[PDB]
């Protein structure tokens, strides 16, 4: 990507945001990988929207890129697993355990086993490591603390957490300059000239 | 929305498309509601990505906006229901029937009942209306035919199916004019001047 193209993406991010196209902002953030929106991430975590959270993360890192991003995905999936136990949906919990958590076993066989054993518990607070789990909201809040630490330390996010400072509506400003450039090439008056479209260059005649 | 803002969205749609930000294109299409991408819609239907399909439709119409859009959502949900029966997942099929299809009962109690009765069949081809269902792919293909008809006749899509014709990279062209405008305000040579950024106006000094 050109640096031109890269900066143009950032202008577009500012535009979409101001025009309040919220879902389009975060899709572009993800796809471009240029900027990671913490505020968004926290919000999705509190809401427990794990599919969206992982999808948003997928724009920035894979699960085994480094030990930070790894512990990030593990924390998220582990909570998803715990919540399934706390609604007593042991059918979903096993599904989670095999399809989402097994990738971590390769790297640590014993932790995967100790977490597997949580299925056979009447309540996972019987485990002294997990005795600290209160309500869902608090668990998500506690885990978000850890997540923000992992992310800010992750070298693949570290320089992506702060949006480029610019004057508001920079793209609109540039567009206006384009209209000025086009009109300045006309050979007729007058100010208050009519601009029919952005699609084709404006003329006066 | 200004007509300026509206046209700027269209330029951005062209940009994202050319830069191949595929998911961002369709999120913006949906959120803005300005353009409905048939090609995309067909592709998602063949893939049977019902959640995305309905989400994409939600940018353009609600389920009860008119009888076209209604028959659109019904067709989609009915197929989702049939596929769940054809994988013998009668647990999901009932879930679908109550949570997705019941809204149609208000408008037609009898059709909802006749479709409910499909649960107790060994195979839904025993119903002569549904005897025509072959494989999944063919069913999706047949139903897509109907869908394209419903959409093109739907007054809320009818004028949204054809993208505004423009020269390629119109936005990039406009940006270039902005650079020309900025530089033309400088008081020094020379062509091949250095442009440091789109973020703040360029100067020569």
């Amino acid at each position: 990507m050109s640096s031109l193209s890269r900066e143009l993406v950032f202008l577009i991010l500012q535009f979409l945001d101001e025009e309040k196209f919220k879902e389009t902002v975060h899709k572009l953030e993800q796809e471009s990988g240029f900027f990671f929106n913490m505020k968004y991430f926290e919000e999705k975590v509190h809401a427990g929207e794990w599919d969206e959270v992982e999808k948003y993360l997928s724009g920035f890192t894979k699960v085994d890129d480094n030990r930070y991003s790894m512990k990030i995905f593990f924390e998220i999936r582990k909570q998803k697993y715990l919540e399934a136990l706390d609604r007593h949906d042991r059918a979903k919990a096993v599904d989670i355990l095999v399809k989402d958590l097994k990738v971590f076993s390769t790297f640590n066989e014993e932790l995967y086993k100790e977490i597997t054993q949580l299925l056979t518990l009447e309540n996972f607070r019987e485990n002294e490591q997990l005795s600290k789990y209160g309500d869902t909201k608090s668990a998500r809040s506690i885990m978000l603390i850890e997540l923000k630490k992992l992310i800010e330390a992750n070298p693949l996010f570290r320089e992506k957490l702060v949006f480029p400072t610019l004057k508001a509506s920079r793209l609109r400003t540039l567009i206006n300059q384009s209209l000025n450039w086009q009109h300045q090439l006309c050979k007729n008056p007058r100010p208050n000239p009519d601009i029919k479209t952005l699609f084709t260059d404006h003329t006066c005649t | 929305m200004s007509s300026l803002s509206r046209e700027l969205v269209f330029l951005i749609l062209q940009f994202l498309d050319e830069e191949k930000f595929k998911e961002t294109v369709h999120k913006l299409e949906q959120e803005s509601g300005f353009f409905f991408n048939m090609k995309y819609f067909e592709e998602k239907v063949h893939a049977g990505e019902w959640d995305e399909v309905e989400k994409y439709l939600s940018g353009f119409t609600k389920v009860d906006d008119n009888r076209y859009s209604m028959k659109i959502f019904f067709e989609i949900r009915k197929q989702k229901y049939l596929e769940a029966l054809d994988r013998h997942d009668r647990a999901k099929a009932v879930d679908i029937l109550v949570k997705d299809l019941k809204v149609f009962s208000t408008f037609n109690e009898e059709l909802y009942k006749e479709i409910t009765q499909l649960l107790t069949l060994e195979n839904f081809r025993e119903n002569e209306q549904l005897s025509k269902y072959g494989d999944t792919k063919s069913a999706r293909s047949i139903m897509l035919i109907e869908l394209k008809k419903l959409i093109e006749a739907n007054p809320l899509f009818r004028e949204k199916l054809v993208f505004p014709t423009l020269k390629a990279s119109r936005l990039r062209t406009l940006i270039n004019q902005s650079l020309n405008w900025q530089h033309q305000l400088c008081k020094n040579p020379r062509p091949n001047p250095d442009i440091k950024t789109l973020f703040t106006d360029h100067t020569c000094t």
């Binding site: 300059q177 601009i195 029919k196 | 200004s2 007509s3 300026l4």
Partner: peptide, 9 residues
């Protein structure tokens, strides 16, 4: 139609 701020005078 479109908004247009002139930038000379």
């Amino acid at each position: 139609n479109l908004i247009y701020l002139d930038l000379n005078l």
